[PDB]
Protein backbone atom coordinates (compact mmCIF):
# COMPACT_ATOMS: atom_id res chain seq x y z
CA UNK A 1 0.00 0.00 0.00
CA UNK A 2 0.91 3.75 -0.33
CA UNK A 3 1.25 5.98 -3.33
CA UNK A 4 4.19 8.34 -3.87
CA UNK A 5 5.76 10.16 -6.87
CA UNK A 6 8.59 7.91 -7.67
CA UNK A 7 11.56 8.09 -9.85
CA UNK A 8 13.43 5.36 -11.58
CA UNK A 9 16.61 4.27 -9.69
CA UNK A 10 19.30 6.54 -11.15
CA UNK A 11 22.50 4.47 -11.12
CA UNK A 12 22.62 3.50 -14.80
CA UNK A 13 22.52 7.11 -15.72
CA UNK A 14 24.71 8.46 -12.96
CA UNK A 15 27.59 6.48 -14.61
CA UNK A 16 26.81 8.52 -17.81
CA UNK A 17 27.39 12.02 -16.48
CA UNK A 18 30.42 14.16 -17.25
CA UNK A 19 31.40 17.82 -17.08
CA UNK A 20 31.94 19.80 -20.22
CA UNK A 21 33.65 23.23 -20.00
CA UNK A 22 34.24 25.69 -22.83
CA UNK A 23 35.87 28.94 -21.96
CA UNK A 24 34.35 30.10 -18.70
CA UNK A 25 31.10 28.04 -19.02
CA UNK A 26 30.84 24.73 -17.25
CA UNK A 27 27.86 22.44 -17.57
CA UNK A 28 26.89 18.72 -17.61
CA UNK A 29 27.14 16.23 -20.54
CA UNK A 30 25.90 12.80 -21.04
CA UNK A 31 28.54 10.23 -22.02
CA UNK A 32 27.42 7.14 -23.92
CA UNK A 33 29.87 4.97 -25.91
CA UNK A 34 32.57 7.17 -27.56
CA UNK A 35 30.30 10.37 -27.57
CA UNK A 36 29.30 13.05 -25.02
CA UNK A 37 26.10 15.09 -25.52
CA UNK A 38 25.63 18.62 -24.13
CA UNK A 39 23.71 21.91 -24.82
CA UNK A 40 25.34 23.77 -27.64
CA UNK A 41 24.86 26.98 -25.58
CA UNK A 42 27.94 25.78 -23.76
CA UNK A 43 29.92 27.72 -26.36
CA UNK A 44 27.93 30.93 -26.01
CA UNK A 45 29.58 33.63 -24.32
CA UNK A 46 29.44 35.70 -21.23
CA UNK A 47 26.09 36.72 -22.61
CA UNK A 48 25.97 36.68 -26.40
CA UNK A 49 23.00 34.51 -25.74
CA UNK A 50 21.22 37.71 -26.68
CA UNK A 51 21.62 36.86 -30.35
CA UNK A 52 23.85 33.80 -30.94
CA UNK A 53 24.60 32.48 -34.40
CA UNK A 54 25.78 29.01 -33.52
CA UNK A 55 26.93 27.76 -36.93
CA UNK A 56 29.32 30.72 -36.74
CA UNK A 57 30.18 30.52 -33.04
CA UNK A 58 31.10 26.82 -33.48
CA UNK A 59 33.27 27.22 -36.61
CA UNK A 60 35.50 29.52 -34.29
CA UNK A 61 36.58 26.54 -32.26
CA UNK A 62 38.41 23.23 -32.28
CA UNK A 63 38.39 19.94 -30.37
CA UNK A 64 40.87 21.14 -27.76
CA UNK A 65 38.45 24.00 -27.05
CA UNK A 66 36.07 21.62 -25.04
CA UNK A 67 37.34 19.76 -21.94
CA UNK A 68 35.36 16.81 -20.72
CA UNK A 69 35.94 15.57 -17.21
CA UNK A 70 34.69 12.20 -15.98
CA UNK A 71 35.53 12.24 -12.26
CA UNK A 72 39.17 13.09 -12.16
CA UNK A 73 39.81 11.93 -15.72
CA UNK A 74 40.14 14.28 -18.70
CA UNK A 75 38.51 12.99 -21.80
CA UNK A 76 40.34 14.02 -24.96
CA UNK A 77 37.89 15.30 -27.58
CA UNK A 78 38.87 14.13 -31.07
CA UNK A 79 35.90 15.39 -33.13
CA UNK A 80 32.55 17.43 -32.44
CA UNK A 81 29.55 18.46 -34.51
CA UNK A 82 26.21 20.13 -33.82
CA UNK A 83 22.83 18.42 -33.93
CA UNK A 84 20.04 20.91 -33.67
CA UNK A 85 20.44 22.44 -30.21
CA UNK A 86 23.04 20.02 -28.92
CA UNK A 87 26.72 19.37 -29.51
CA UNK A 88 28.11 15.88 -29.80
CA UNK A 89 31.86 15.72 -28.92
CA UNK A 90 33.62 12.49 -29.86
CA UNK A 91 36.04 11.40 -27.10
CA UNK A 92 39.09 9.00 -27.31
CA UNK A 93 37.30 6.70 -24.82
CA UNK A 94 34.20 4.60 -24.97
CA UNK A 95 32.22 4.97 -21.66
CA UNK A 96 32.53 1.53 -20.09
CA UNK A 97 29.45 1.96 -18.03
CA UNK A 98 27.14 2.81 -21.03
CA UNK A 99 23.81 1.06 -20.22
CA UNK A 100 21.63 -0.49 -22.96
CA UNK A 101 19.73 2.76 -24.07
CA UNK A 102 17.45 4.53 -26.59
CA UNK A 103 16.53 8.13 -27.29
CA UNK A 104 12.82 8.87 -27.36
CA UNK A 105 10.84 12.05 -27.84
CA UNK A 106 8.24 11.96 -25.18
CA UNK A 107 4.73 13.46 -25.46
CA UNK A 108 2.91 16.03 -23.44
CA UNK A 109 1.40 14.34 -20.48
CA UNK A 110 4.04 11.67 -20.03
CA UNK A 111 6.30 11.52 -17.02
CA UNK A 112 10.05 10.92 -16.59
CA UNK A 113 12.68 11.10 -13.84
CA UNK A 114 15.29 13.89 -13.83
CA UNK A 115 18.70 13.44 -12.36
CA UNK A 116 19.77 16.97 -11.47
CA UNK A 117 23.54 17.45 -11.78
CA UNK A 118 26.10 20.26 -11.12
CA UNK A 119 29.67 20.25 -12.68
CA UNK A 120 29.06 16.73 -13.80
CA UNK A 121 28.17 15.30 -10.41
CA UNK A 122 24.64 13.92 -9.74
CA UNK A 123 22.91 15.56 -6.90
CA UNK A 124 19.30 14.44 -6.68
CA UNK A 125 16.57 12.76 -8.64
CA UNK A 126 12.82 13.54 -8.97
CA UNK A 127 9.92 12.76 -11.15
CA UNK A 128 7.90 15.11 -13.30
CA UNK A 129 5.70 15.37 -16.35
CA UNK A 130 5.99 17.16 -19.70
CA UNK A 131 3.35 19.79 -19.38
CA UNK A 132 0.84 20.40 -22.17
CA UNK A 133 2.60 23.74 -22.67
CA UNK A 134 5.96 21.85 -23.24
CA UNK A 135 7.73 22.92 -20.12
CA UNK A 136 8.35 20.99 -16.96
CA UNK A 137 8.16 22.29 -13.41
CA UNK A 138 11.63 21.07 -12.54
CA UNK A 139 13.91 22.23 -9.79
CA UNK A 140 17.21 23.50 -11.26
CA UNK A 141 19.78 26.01 -10.24
CA UNK A 142 22.71 27.59 -12.13
CA UNK A 143 24.91 24.93 -13.53
CA UNK A 144 22.30 22.30 -14.10
CA UNK A 145 22.19 22.55 -17.92
CA UNK A 146 22.70 19.25 -19.51
CA UNK A 147 20.96 17.30 -16.63
CA UNK A 148 18.95 14.58 -18.31
CA UNK A 149 15.39 13.03 -17.99
CA UNK A 150 14.88 9.32 -18.61
CA UNK A 151 12.59 6.32 -18.10
CA UNK A 152 13.88 2.81 -17.65
CA UNK A 153 12.24 -0.23 -19.22
CA UNK A 154 13.82 -3.55 -18.16
CA UNK A 155 17.46 -2.79 -18.31
CA UNK A 156 17.13 -0.27 -21.20
CA UNK A 157 17.43 3.45 -20.39
CA UNK A 158 15.27 5.61 -22.62
CA UNK A 159 16.64 9.14 -22.52
CA UNK A 160 14.03 11.85 -23.32
CA UNK A 161 15.04 15.34 -21.96
CA UNK A 162 18.15 17.34 -21.71
CA UNK A 163 17.90 20.57 -19.70
CA UNK A 164 18.72 23.91 -21.47
CA UNK A 165 16.82 26.95 -20.09
CA UNK A 166 14.67 28.41 -17.27
CA UNK A 167 11.70 30.59 -18.26
CA UNK A 168 10.50 33.75 -16.68
CA UNK A 169 7.86 32.11 -14.40
CA UNK A 170 10.40 29.61 -13.09
CA UNK A 171 9.55 26.57 -15.22
CA UNK A 172 12.09 24.82 -17.41
CA UNK A 173 12.40 24.11 -21.19
CA UNK A 174 14.92 21.85 -23.00
CA UNK A 175 15.16 19.27 -25.73
CA UNK A 176 15.25 15.57 -26.55
CA UNK A 177 18.63 13.93 -27.17
CA UNK A 178 18.48 14.70 -30.77
CA UNK A 179 18.59 18.42 -29.90
CA UNK A 180 15.08 19.35 -30.79
CA UNK A 181 13.37 21.52 -28.24
CA UNK A 182 10.10 20.58 -26.68
CA UNK A 183 7.84 23.53 -27.37
CA UNK A 184 8.27 26.75 -29.33
CA UNK A 185 11.44 27.63 -27.23
CA UNK A 186 14.95 28.54 -28.70
CA UNK A 187 18.42 28.59 -26.99
CA UNK A 188 18.75 32.28 -26.99
CA UNK A 189 17.96 34.87 -24.28
CA UNK A 190 14.78 36.32 -25.72
CA UNK A 191 11.44 37.42 -24.33
CA UNK A 192 9.68 34.07 -24.53
CA UNK A 193 7.38 32.74 -21.89
CA UNK A 194 5.63 29.43 -21.17
CA UNK A 195 2.10 29.62 -22.74
CA UNK A 196 -1.03 28.74 -20.83
CA UNK A 197 -1.09 25.19 -19.45
CA UNK A 198 -4.04 22.84 -18.89
CA UNK A 199 -4.46 19.90 -16.55
CA UNK A 200 -3.58 16.45 -17.96
CA UNK A 201 -7.08 14.83 -17.73
CA UNK A 202 -5.95 11.29 -18.58
CA UNK A 203 -3.58 11.52 -15.60
CA UNK A 204 -6.02 12.75 -13.11
CA UNK A 205 -8.36 9.95 -14.12
CA UNK A 206 -5.53 7.38 -13.74
CA UNK A 207 -4.88 8.66 -10.25
CA UNK A 208 -8.54 8.22 -9.24
CA UNK A 209 -8.26 4.58 -10.33
CA UNK A 210 -5.13 4.49 -8.12
CA UNK A 211 -7.13 5.74 -5.15
CA UNK A 212 -9.77 3.03 -5.66
CA UNK A 213 -7.09 0.27 -6.31
CA UNK A 214 -5.56 1.34 -2.97
CA UNK A 215 -8.92 1.11 -1.54
CA UNK A 216 -10.68 4.47 -1.64
CA UNK A 217 -14.24 4.84 -3.20
CA UNK A 218 -15.65 8.11 -1.71
CA UNK A 219 -15.87 10.46 -4.83
CA UNK A 220 -17.58 7.80 -6.99
CA UNK A 221 -21.31 8.34 -7.81
CA UNK A 222 -24.23 6.60 -9.53
CA UNK A 223 -23.96 8.74 -12.68
CA UNK A 224 -22.38 8.35 -16.09
CA UNK A 225 -21.70 11.00 -18.70
CA UNK A 226 -21.05 11.06 -22.44
CA UNK A 227 -17.65 12.09 -23.60
CA UNK A 228 -19.23 15.20 -25.03
CA UNK A 229 -20.90 16.44 -21.86
CA UNK A 230 -17.75 15.63 -20.01
CA UNK A 231 -15.55 17.81 -22.18
CA UNK A 232 -17.84 20.80 -22.15
CA UNK A 233 -17.29 20.70 -18.37
CA UNK A 234 -13.57 19.92 -18.65
CA UNK A 235 -12.98 22.88 -20.97
CA UNK A 236 -14.64 25.26 -18.44
CA UNK A 237 -12.21 24.11 -15.66
CA UNK A 238 -9.19 24.20 -18.03
CA UNK A 239 -8.70 20.40 -18.35
CA UNK A 240 -7.55 18.95 -21.70
CA UNK A 241 -10.35 17.48 -23.64
CA UNK A 242 -10.77 13.76 -23.25
CA UNK A 243 -10.85 11.70 -26.41
CA UNK A 244 -11.72 8.09 -27.07
CA UNK A 245 -7.98 7.26 -27.27
CA UNK A 246 -7.53 8.27 -23.58
CA UNK A 247 -10.75 6.50 -22.69
CA UNK A 248 -9.24 3.31 -24.22
CA UNK A 249 -5.93 3.74 -22.35
CA UNK A 250 -7.75 3.55 -19.02
CA UNK A 251 -9.22 0.13 -20.06
CA UNK A 252 -6.98 -2.08 -17.83
CA UNK A 253 -7.39 0.06 -14.67
CA UNK A 254 -11.14 0.17 -15.32
CA UNK A 255 -11.27 -3.63 -15.59
CA UNK A 256 -9.20 -4.06 -12.39
CA UNK A 257 -11.69 -1.81 -10.47
CA UNK A 258 -15.09 -2.56 -12.09
CA UNK A 259 -15.58 1.23 -12.69
CA UNK A 260 -16.47 2.38 -16.25
CA UNK A 261 -14.29 5.20 -17.49
CA UNK A 262 -17.28 7.39 -18.23
CA UNK A 263 -18.51 6.66 -14.76
CA UNK A 264 -15.10 7.76 -13.55
CA UNK A 265 -15.56 10.90 -15.75
CA UNK A 266 -18.91 11.64 -14.04
CA UNK A 267 -17.20 11.32 -10.75
CA UNK A 268 -14.46 13.83 -11.81
CA UNK A 269 -16.91 16.23 -13.36
CA UNK A 270 -18.54 16.07 -9.84
CA UNK A 271 -15.23 16.76 -8.14
CA UNK A 272 -14.83 19.74 -10.51
CA UNK A 273 -18.33 21.00 -9.85
CA UNK A 274 -18.64 20.22 -6.09
CA UNK A 275 -14.94 20.82 -5.02
CA UNK A 276 -13.08 18.33 -2.81
CA UNK A 277 -14.70 19.74 0.29
CA UNK A 278 -12.48 19.06 2.98
CA UNK A 279 -11.55 15.55 1.90
CA UNK A 280 -8.34 14.26 0.46
CA UNK A 281 -7.55 11.67 -2.22
CA UNK A 282 -4.43 9.53 -1.74
CA UNK A 283 -3.36 12.32 0.69
CA UNK A 284 -3.92 15.24 -1.69
CA UNK A 285 -6.46 17.99 -1.41
CA UNK A 286 -6.26 18.69 -5.18
CA UNK A 287 -6.61 16.55 -8.25
CA UNK A 288 -3.12 15.36 -9.22
CA UNK A 289 -2.08 15.06 -12.85
CA UNK A 290 1.47 14.08 -12.80
CA UNK A 291 0.80 10.36 -12.77
CA UNK A 292 0.18 8.44 -15.96
CA UNK A 293 -1.94 5.36 -16.28
CA UNK A 294 1.34 3.38 -16.65
CA UNK A 295 2.90 4.86 -13.59
CA UNK A 296 -0.22 3.87 -11.74
CA UNK A 297 -0.10 0.26 -12.97
CA UNK A 298 3.76 -0.07 -12.29
CA UNK A 299 3.34 1.25 -8.74
CA UNK A 300 -0.04 -0.27 -7.78
CA UNK A 301 -1.05 -3.71 -6.73
CA UNK A 302 -2.19 -6.09 -9.43
CA UNK A 303 -5.00 -7.01 -6.97
CA UNK A 304 -7.67 -4.35 -6.05
CA UNK A 305 -8.41 -3.51 -2.37
CA UNK A 306 -12.07 -4.32 -2.91
CA UNK B 1 14.24 28.00 -9.38
CA UNK B 2 11.59 25.32 -8.53
CA UNK B 3 11.08 23.18 -5.48
CA UNK B 4 10.42 19.43 -5.63
CA UNK B 5 10.71 16.48 -3.18
CA UNK B 6 13.96 15.02 -4.21
CA UNK B 7 15.81 11.92 -3.47
CA UNK B 8 19.48 11.27 -3.41
CA UNK B 9 20.79 9.63 -6.64
CA UNK B 10 20.49 5.90 -5.90
CA UNK B 11 23.38 4.25 -7.76
CA UNK B 12 25.75 3.72 -4.83
CA UNK B 13 23.07 1.79 -3.07
CA UNK B 14 21.62 -0.01 -6.06
CA UNK B 15 25.02 -1.85 -6.29
CA UNK B 16 24.34 -3.01 -2.65
CA UNK B 17 21.09 -4.88 -3.18
CA UNK B 18 20.74 -8.65 -3.21
CA UNK B 19 17.98 -11.22 -2.85
CA UNK B 20 17.82 -13.44 0.18
CA UNK B 21 15.50 -16.50 0.14
CA UNK B 22 14.83 -18.90 2.99
CA UNK B 23 12.37 -21.65 2.38
CA UNK B 24 9.49 -20.14 0.43
CA UNK B 25 10.15 -16.49 1.54
CA UNK B 26 12.09 -14.20 -0.74
CA UNK B 27 13.03 -10.67 0.19
CA UNK B 28 15.78 -8.04 -0.31
CA UNK B 29 19.15 -7.75 1.53
CA UNK B 30 21.77 -5.16 1.63
CA UNK B 31 25.28 -6.34 0.76
CA UNK B 32 28.22 -4.36 2.11
CA UNK B 33 31.76 -5.83 2.30
CA UNK B 34 31.59 -9.58 3.19
CA UNK B 35 28.09 -9.26 4.94
CA UNK B 36 24.44 -9.12 3.78
CA UNK B 37 21.77 -7.57 6.04
CA UNK B 38 18.08 -8.57 5.90
CA UNK B 39 14.91 -8.76 8.12
CA UNK B 40 15.12 -11.74 10.39
CA UNK B 41 11.42 -12.41 9.58
CA UNK B 42 12.81 -13.93 6.42
CA UNK B 43 12.99 -17.19 8.37
CA UNK B 44 9.43 -17.01 9.68
CA UNK B 45 7.10 -19.30 8.20
CA UNK B 46 4.06 -19.43 6.07
CA UNK B 47 2.53 -17.48 8.91
CA UNK B 48 4.07 -18.31 12.27
CA UNK B 49 4.52 -14.60 12.37
CA UNK B 50 1.58 -14.92 14.73
CA UNK B 51 3.95 -15.77 17.57
CA UNK B 52 7.56 -16.27 16.40
CA UNK B 53 10.36 -17.10 18.80
CA UNK B 54 13.33 -16.16 16.67
CA UNK B 55 16.20 -17.35 18.88
CA UNK B 56 14.53 -20.76 18.47
CA UNK B 57 13.50 -20.45 14.82
CA UNK B 58 17.11 -19.50 13.90
CA UNK B 59 18.85 -22.30 15.86
CA UNK B 60 16.81 -24.70 13.48
CA UNK B 61 18.86 -23.64 10.52
CA UNK B 62 22.30 -23.53 8.95
CA UNK B 63 24.25 -21.42 6.46
CA UNK B 64 23.09 -23.43 3.45
CA UNK B 65 19.53 -22.63 4.54
CA UNK B 66 19.80 -18.98 3.16
CA UNK B 67 20.55 -18.35 -0.54
CA UNK B 68 21.77 -14.94 -1.54
CA UNK B 69 21.58 -13.93 -5.16
CA UNK B 70 23.43 -10.93 -6.57
CA UNK B 71 22.18 -10.71 -10.17
CA UNK B 72 22.77 -14.14 -11.53
CA UNK B 73 25.43 -14.99 -8.97
CA UNK B 74 24.82 -17.18 -5.90
CA UNK B 75 26.57 -15.96 -2.84
CA UNK B 76 27.68 -18.78 -0.56
CA UNK B 77 26.79 -18.02 3.06
CA UNK B 78 29.56 -19.13 5.43
CA UNK B 79 28.26 -17.79 8.76
CA UNK B 80 25.04 -15.83 10.05
CA UNK B 81 23.92 -14.36 13.35
CA UNK B 82 21.02 -12.22 14.54
CA UNK B 83 21.24 -8.58 15.59
CA UNK B 84 18.03 -7.42 17.14
CA UNK B 85 15.48 -7.64 14.32
CA UNK B 86 17.92 -8.30 11.52
CA UNK B 87 20.07 -11.19 10.36
CA UNK B 88 23.61 -10.71 9.17
CA UNK B 89 24.76 -13.53 6.82
CA UNK B 90 28.49 -13.65 6.11
CA UNK B 91 29.16 -14.44 2.42
CA UNK B 92 32.37 -15.85 0.76
CA UNK B 93 32.61 -12.61 -1.27
CA UNK B 94 33.28 -9.03 -0.39
CA UNK B 95 30.88 -6.73 -2.39
CA UNK B 96 33.21 -4.91 -4.75
CA UNK B 97 30.87 -2.03 -5.18
CA UNK B 98 30.54 -1.27 -1.39
CA UNK B 99 30.44 2.57 -1.17
CA UNK B 100 32.06 4.47 1.74
CA UNK B 101 29.10 4.17 4.31
CA UNK B 102 27.82 4.57 7.89
CA UNK B 103 24.76 3.39 9.79
CA UNK B 104 22.81 6.10 11.55
CA UNK B 105 19.63 6.07 13.59
CA UNK B 106 17.65 8.94 12.30
CA UNK B 107 15.22 11.06 14.36
CA UNK B 108 11.58 11.83 13.98
CA UNK B 109 11.21 14.65 11.59
CA UNK B 110 14.22 13.87 9.44
CA UNK B 111 13.95 12.82 5.83
CA UNK B 112 15.66 10.09 3.77
CA UNK B 113 15.35 8.51 0.32
CA UNK B 114 13.98 4.96 -0.06
CA UNK B 115 15.01 2.70 -2.86
CA UNK B 116 12.09 0.29 -3.20
CA UNK B 117 13.21 -3.16 -4.36
CA UNK B 118 11.54 -6.52 -5.29
CA UNK B 119 13.51 -9.88 -5.39
CA UNK B 120 16.68 -7.92 -5.04
CA UNK B 121 16.15 -5.62 -8.00
CA UNK B 122 15.72 -1.84 -7.48
CA UNK B 123 12.54 -0.48 -8.85
CA UNK B 124 12.06 3.13 -7.84
CA UNK B 125 13.26 5.74 -5.42
CA UNK B 126 11.36 8.41 -3.40
CA UNK B 127 11.84 10.66 -0.50
CA UNK B 128 10.02 10.64 2.81
CA UNK B 129 10.24 11.59 6.45
CA UNK B 130 10.23 9.63 9.72
CA UNK B 131 6.93 10.62 11.18
CA UNK B 132 6.64 11.72 14.81
CA UNK B 133 4.72 8.48 15.37
CA UNK B 134 7.76 6.46 14.01
CA UNK B 135 6.24 5.24 10.81
CA UNK B 136 6.79 6.47 7.31
CA UNK B 137 4.17 6.87 4.59
CA UNK B 138 6.11 4.79 2.10
CA UNK B 139 4.85 3.01 -0.96
CA UNK B 140 5.62 -0.73 -0.70
CA UNK B 141 4.05 -3.86 -2.02
CA UNK B 142 4.60 -7.54 -1.18
CA UNK B 143 8.20 -8.43 -1.52
CA UNK B 144 9.66 -5.10 -0.61
CA UNK B 145 10.99 -6.09 2.85
CA UNK B 146 14.58 -5.28 3.22
CA UNK B 147 14.37 -2.15 0.92
CA UNK B 148 16.59 0.44 2.53
CA UNK B 149 16.44 4.25 3.33
CA UNK B 150 19.60 6.35 3.15
CA UNK B 151 21.05 9.87 2.90
CA UNK B 152 24.26 10.63 1.10
CA UNK B 153 26.84 13.10 2.39
CA UNK B 154 29.75 13.68 -0.03
CA UNK B 155 30.53 10.24 -1.20
CA UNK B 156 29.49 8.55 2.10
CA UNK B 157 26.17 6.67 2.20
CA UNK B 158 24.49 6.85 5.58
CA UNK B 159 22.00 3.99 5.81
CA UNK B 160 19.12 4.64 8.27
CA UNK B 161 16.02 2.42 7.53
CA UNK B 162 15.40 -1.10 6.53
CA UNK B 163 11.78 -1.98 5.68
CA UNK B 164 10.03 -4.75 7.73
CA UNK B 165 6.22 -4.31 8.06
CA UNK B 166 3.06 -2.54 6.83
CA UNK B 167 0.55 -1.38 9.47
CA UNK B 168 -3.18 -1.54 9.37
CA UNK B 169 -3.72 2.04 8.05
CA UNK B 170 -1.24 1.48 5.23
CA UNK B 171 1.86 3.16 6.69
CA UNK B 172 5.16 1.34 7.13
CA UNK B 173 7.41 0.50 10.13
CA UNK B 174 10.98 -0.95 10.12
CA UNK B 175 14.33 -0.56 11.77
CA UNK B 176 17.79 0.98 11.52
CA UNK B 177 20.66 -1.19 10.27
CA UNK B 178 21.44 -2.34 13.68
CA UNK B 179 18.02 -4.04 13.81
CA UNK B 180 16.32 -1.80 16.26
CA UNK B 181 12.82 -0.80 15.27
CA UNK B 182 11.76 2.77 15.01
CA UNK B 183 8.75 3.03 17.28
CA UNK B 184 7.03 0.60 19.62
CA UNK B 185 6.60 -1.95 16.70
CA UNK B 186 7.75 -5.69 16.78
CA UNK B 187 8.28 -8.18 13.87
CA UNK B 188 5.33 -10.27 14.66
CA UNK B 189 1.77 -10.21 13.25
CA UNK B 190 -0.03 -8.64 16.18
CA UNK B 191 -2.75 -6.04 16.61
CA UNK B 192 -0.52 -2.97 16.66
CA UNK B 193 -1.34 0.26 14.97
CA UNK B 194 0.47 3.52 14.22
CA UNK B 195 -0.34 5.98 17.10
CA UNK B 196 -1.55 9.50 16.49
CA UNK B 197 0.83 11.65 14.42
CA UNK B 198 1.47 15.40 14.55
CA UNK B 199 2.80 17.79 11.93
CA UNK B 200 6.58 18.40 11.95
CA UNK B 201 6.54 22.17 12.78
CA UNK B 202 10.26 22.76 12.17
CA UNK B 203 9.72 21.41 8.64
CA UNK B 204 6.77 23.46 7.77
CA UNK B 205 8.66 26.54 8.92
CA UNK B 206 11.69 25.54 6.78
CA UNK B 207 9.43 25.24 3.78
CA UNK B 208 8.03 28.76 4.28
CA UNK B 209 11.62 30.05 4.21
CA UNK B 210 11.94 28.03 0.97
CA UNK B 211 8.94 29.84 -0.51
CA UNK B 212 10.43 33.24 0.35
CA UNK B 213 13.99 32.20 -0.87
CA UNK B 214 12.29 31.23 -4.16
CA UNK B 215 10.65 34.50 -4.09
CA UNK B 216 7.25 34.30 -2.44
CA UNK B 217 6.26 36.69 0.48
CA UNK B 218 2.41 36.63 0.58
CA UNK B 219 1.65 34.88 3.99
CA UNK B 220 4.12 37.07 5.92
CA UNK B 221 2.63 39.71 8.30
CA UNK B 222 3.71 42.57 10.57
CA UNK B 223 3.32 40.50 13.76
CA UNK B 224 5.62 38.53 16.00
CA UNK B 225 4.74 36.01 18.68
CA UNK B 226 6.47 34.49 21.70
CA UNK B 227 7.34 30.86 21.58
CA UNK B 228 4.75 30.29 24.26
CA UNK B 229 1.80 31.86 22.48
CA UNK B 230 2.88 30.10 19.36
CA UNK B 231 2.76 26.65 20.90
CA UNK B 232 -0.58 27.10 22.57
CA UNK B 233 -1.85 27.63 19.00
CA UNK B 234 0.29 24.84 17.52
CA UNK B 235 -1.01 22.31 20.05
CA UNK B 236 -4.64 23.16 19.12
CA UNK B 237 -3.94 22.40 15.39
CA UNK B 238 -1.92 19.24 16.25
CA UNK B 239 1.55 20.62 15.38
CA UNK B 240 4.56 19.54 17.48
CA UNK B 241 5.55 22.11 19.96
CA UNK B 242 8.34 24.39 18.87
CA UNK B 243 11.33 24.68 21.15
CA UNK B 244 14.28 27.02 21.18
CA UNK B 245 16.44 24.26 19.62
CA UNK B 246 14.25 24.31 16.45
CA UNK B 247 14.17 28.09 16.55
CA UNK B 248 18.02 28.02 16.48
CA UNK B 249 18.11 25.51 13.58
CA UNK B 250 16.24 27.96 11.36
CA UNK B 251 18.97 30.61 12.02
CA UNK B 252 20.72 30.38 8.59
CA UNK B 253 17.49 30.46 6.53
CA UNK B 254 16.29 33.37 8.67
CA UNK B 255 19.51 35.28 8.00
CA UNK B 256 19.32 34.57 4.25
CA UNK B 257 15.74 36.02 4.14
CA UNK B 258 15.77 38.82 6.77
CA UNK B 259 12.68 37.21 8.44
CA UNK B 260 12.85 36.50 12.23
CA UNK B 261 11.81 32.98 13.12
CA UNK B 262 9.19 34.21 15.55
CA UNK B 263 7.92 36.47 12.83
CA UNK B 264 7.77 33.38 10.63
CA UNK B 265 5.88 31.66 13.54
CA UNK B 266 3.32 34.52 13.60
CA UNK B 267 2.87 34.08 9.94
CA UNK B 268 2.22 30.29 10.37
CA UNK B 269 -0.05 30.77 13.33
CA UNK B 270 -1.96 33.08 10.88
CA UNK B 271 -2.01 30.41 8.20
CA UNK B 272 -3.38 28.03 10.86
CA UNK B 273 -5.99 30.49 12.03
CA UNK B 274 -6.99 32.07 8.67
CA UNK B 275 -6.57 28.95 6.36
CA UNK B 276 -4.72 29.18 3.04
CA UNK B 277 -7.76 30.62 1.34
CA UNK B 278 -7.47 29.77 -2.10
CA UNK B 279 -3.77 30.45 -2.42
CA UNK B 280 -0.92 28.05 -2.80
CA UNK B 281 2.63 28.00 -1.41
CA UNK B 282 5.37 26.57 -3.66
CA UNK B 283 2.44 24.91 -5.53
CA UNK B 284 0.78 23.34 -2.48
CA UNK B 285 -2.57 24.18 -0.99
CA UNK B 286 -1.52 22.72 2.40
CA UNK B 287 1.39 23.30 4.70
CA UNK B 288 4.06 20.73 3.82
CA UNK B 289 6.19 19.11 6.50
CA UNK B 290 8.30 16.65 4.76
CA UNK B 291 11.14 19.04 4.07
CA UNK B 292 13.82 19.70 6.65
CA UNK B 293 15.74 22.91 7.03
CA UNK B 294 18.75 21.05 5.51
CA UNK B 295 16.84 19.79 2.56
CA UNK B 296 15.75 23.34 1.97
CA UNK B 297 19.31 24.71 2.09
CA UNK B 298 20.73 21.83 -0.17
CA UNK B 299 18.02 22.41 -2.78
CA UNK B 300 17.64 26.22 -2.61
CA UNK B 301 19.71 29.02 -3.98
CA UNK B 302 22.39 30.47 -1.74
CA UNK B 303 21.10 33.87 -2.97
CA UNK B 304 17.52 35.03 -2.02
CA UNK B 305 15.04 36.14 -4.73
CA UNK B 306 14.58 39.46 -2.96
CL1 LIG C 1 17.03 24.88 -34.50
CL1 LIG D 1 18.34 26.63 -15.21
CL1 LIG E 1 13.94 -7.07 20.10
CL1 LIG F 1 5.05 -4.20 3.08
UniProtKB/Swiss-Prot annotation, chains A, B:
The gene is rep. The chain holds residues 3241 to 3546 of 7073 of the full protein. Monomer. Homodimer. Only the homodimer shows catalytic activity. It is found in: Host cytoplasm; Host Golgi apparatus. It catalyses: TSAVLQ-|-SGFRK-NH2 and SGVTFQ-|-GKFKK the two peptides corresponding to the two self-cleavage sites of the SARS 3C-like proteinase are the two most reactive peptide substrates. The enzyme exhibits a strong preference for substrates containing Gln at P1 position and Leu at P2 position. Residues 1-306 form the Peptidase C30 domain. It comes from Severe acute respiratory syndrome coronavirus (SARS-CoV). Residues 1-306 are cytoplasmic. Cleaves the C-terminus of replicase polyprotein at 11 sites. Recognizes substrates containing the core sequence [ILMVF]-Q-|-[SGACN]. May cleave human NLRP1 in lung epithelial cells, thereby activating the NLRP1 inflammasome pathway. Also able to bind an ADP-ribose-1''-phosphate (ADRP). May cleave host ATP6V1G1 thereby modifying host vacuoles intracellular pH. This is 3C-like proteinase nsp5. Changing residue 248 to E: In strain: Isolate BJ04. It comes from the Viruses. The lineage of its organism: Viruses, Riboviria, Orthornavirae, Pisuviricota, Pisoniviricetes.
Amino acid sequence: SGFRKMAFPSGKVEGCMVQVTCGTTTLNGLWLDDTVYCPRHVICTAEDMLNPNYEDLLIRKSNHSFLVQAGNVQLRVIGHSMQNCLLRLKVDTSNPKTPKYKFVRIQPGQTFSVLACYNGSPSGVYQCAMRPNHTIKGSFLNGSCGSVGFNIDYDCVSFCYMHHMELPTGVHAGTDLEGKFYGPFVDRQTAQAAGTDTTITLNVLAWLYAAVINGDRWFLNRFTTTLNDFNLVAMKYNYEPLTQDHVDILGPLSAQTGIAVLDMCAALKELLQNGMNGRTILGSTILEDEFTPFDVVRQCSGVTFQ
